[PDB]
UniProtKB/Swiss-Prot annotation, chains A, B:
Function: Effector E3 ubiquitin ligase that interferes with host's ubiquitination pathway and modulates the acute inflammatory responses, thus facilitating bacterial colonization within the host cell. Interacts with IKBKG (NEMO) and TNIP1 (ABIN-1), a ubiquitin-binding adapter protein, which results in TNIP1-dependent 'Lys-27'-linked polyubiquitination of IKBKG. Consequently, polyubiquitinated IKBKG undergoes proteasome-dependent degradation, which perturbs NF-kappa-B activation during bacterial infection. Mediates polyubiquitination of host U2AF1, leading to its proteasomal degradation.
Catalytic residue list: 82
UniProt-recorded name of the protein: E3 ubiquitin-protein ligase ipaH9.8
Family named by the database record: Belongs to the LRR-containing bacterial E3 ligase family.
Effect of inactivating the gene: In murine lung infection model, mutants cause severe inflammatory responses, with increased pro-inflammatory cytokine production levels. Colonization is greatly reduced.
Post-translational events: Autoubiquitinated (in vitro). Ubiquitinated in the presence of host E1 ubiquitin-activating enzyme, E2 ubiquitin-conjugating enzyme and ubiquitin.
Quaternary structure annotation from Swiss-Prot or TrEMBL: Also interacts with human and mouse U2AF1 (U2AF35).
BP terms from Gene Ontology: proteasome-mediated ubiquitin-dependent protein catabolic process; protein autoubiquitination; protein K27-linked ubiquitination; protein K48-linked ubiquitination; symbiont-mediated suppression of host defenses; symbiont-mediated suppression of host inflammatory response; symbiont-mediated suppression of host innate immune response; symbiont-mediated suppression of host NF-kappaB cascade
The species this protein was found in: Shigella flexneri
Key words, A-Z: Host cytoplasm, Host nucleus, Leucine-rich repeat, Plasmid, Repeat, Secreted, Transferase, Ubl conjugation, Ubl conjugation pathway, Virulence
Residues of the full protein shown: 254 to 534 of 545
Length: 263, 263
């Protein structure tokens, strides 16, 4: 609780009576979250005299009910934002799991499940783009929650009820347009390819060797010749990396199209 | 510790032996921080069956030393980022304090201290702009730490040692260029003005009344006439808000210049 998170900033003598005071605010708004902030502020010892500065500050919140009203809400905003990052990290942990499970061989001959899980990860990525423009990413967290049943996601408050109608319709649309292409460049999917079709994996990796020595240096040069930027790597590298991305997008799209027919 | 943060996700029967297993990882890298994540993940009950999903996931980290290596580091990245937000929130709390202290009358005839504290807040704002372009804002946290003695701040790892030489020289420069103007629009400074020079405060607020009815509607119209955008509020409001910002920047700059001579 709050009475204990505040008291841990004071010396032994003042410990008991400061604890006595702060028990009158226990059930104020944000009192739940502000107490968490003090504990998460307590970790940064990487110090002598700073705890004395915080205690002096904490004493001032005892006096004013308005200053404490603000400070509780500002710290609540950080905690509300922290719990959002926490909710996102869980998606990144599941992104890690899939990479490992696939390389372990869980999906070896279960392509239906990986393909389905890939769709779930793709829709989340497209929800990130739906937030990155509205211009606070707790809106992405809001979209994910509501569309969990409608778009099949295993992870009013925010925006309008009709805003969900647009995003969903744009997810269904972009899934049709990309997915297959994006899935071809997916980590966990590459993990299954090195395990299952090792022979065909040696096919695609040799085509990169072939394309990087032969076509790459020429097809960058003539792109740079057409644009009129033969000089400074800001033009050379920026274009060169795109050729690599597009040669990859091509080769891997072909390969995925080959092995999904075999199922 | 970690042995207890993991075990809290399991039923009574499995509680004891799961706790027994996880005591072998206590002193792995990031083990300190991953244990905090599980506790901060434990708060989001806003559920039945989810704890069973996490426990099933936690069981898989017991098996693989590599999957656990990753998952510990990914959760550590979130925690490292969370402690950064925590370090920033403390600056916002001190921003709240000043507003209150000034309205309380702590600075009433102590303008030297508020002016000095304003400089500290201004330099932090300019450090935010020094980060918003480098393109992860833990770099701002890095700048603040190192320049705390050099720029007088009361709150290698990151970037180059010579990068500090640029930023500082640009702080000294922008302080000279703005500050006085920025301080004129500062909250805590407005708080002292309503208390001290209440008579002169009635002077500036009536000039806004005068400028909003008289000059504003005309000076927006002829700016919009010159640009050729007489229509759609995307042109009207965008320009109108600038006139308000500039009339304010003017009036308040004059006022601050008046009362600082009186000291």
């Amino acid at each position: 609780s709050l009475a204990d998170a505040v008291t841990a900033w004071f010396p032994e003598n003042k410990q008991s009576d400061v604890s006595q005071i702060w028990h009158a605010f226990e059930h104020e708004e944000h009192a739940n979250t502000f107490s968490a902030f003090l504990d998460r502020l307590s970790d940064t010892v990487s110090t002598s005299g700073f705890r004395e500065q915080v205690a002096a500050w904490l004493e001032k919140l005892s006096a004013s009910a308005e200053l404490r009203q603000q400070s509780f809400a500002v710290a609540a905003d950080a905690t509300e934002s922290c719990e959002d990052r926490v909710a996102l990290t869980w998606n990144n942990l599941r992104k890690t799991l899939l990479v490992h499970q696939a390389s372990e061989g869980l999906f070896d001959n279960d392509t239906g499940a990986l393909l389905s899980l890939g769709r779930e990860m793709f829709r989340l990525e497209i929800l990130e783009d739906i937030a990155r423009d509205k211009v606070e990413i707790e809106v992405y967290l809001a979209f994910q929650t509501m569309l969990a049943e409608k778009l099949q996601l295993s992870t009013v408050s925010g925006v309008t009820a009709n805003d969900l109608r647009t995003a969903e319709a744009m997810v269904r649309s972009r899934e049709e347009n990309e997915f297959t292409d994006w899935f071809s460049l997916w980590g966990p999917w590459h993990a299954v390819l090195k395990r299952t079709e090792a022979d065909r994996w040696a096919q695609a990796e040799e085509q990169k060797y072939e394309m990087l020595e032969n076509e790459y240096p020429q097809r960058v040069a003539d792109r740079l010749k057409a644009s009129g930027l033969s000089g400074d790597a800001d033009a050379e590298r920026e274009a060169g990396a795109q050729v690599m991305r597009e040669t990859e997008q091509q080769i891997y799209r072909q390969l995925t199209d080959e092995v999904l027919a075999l199922r």
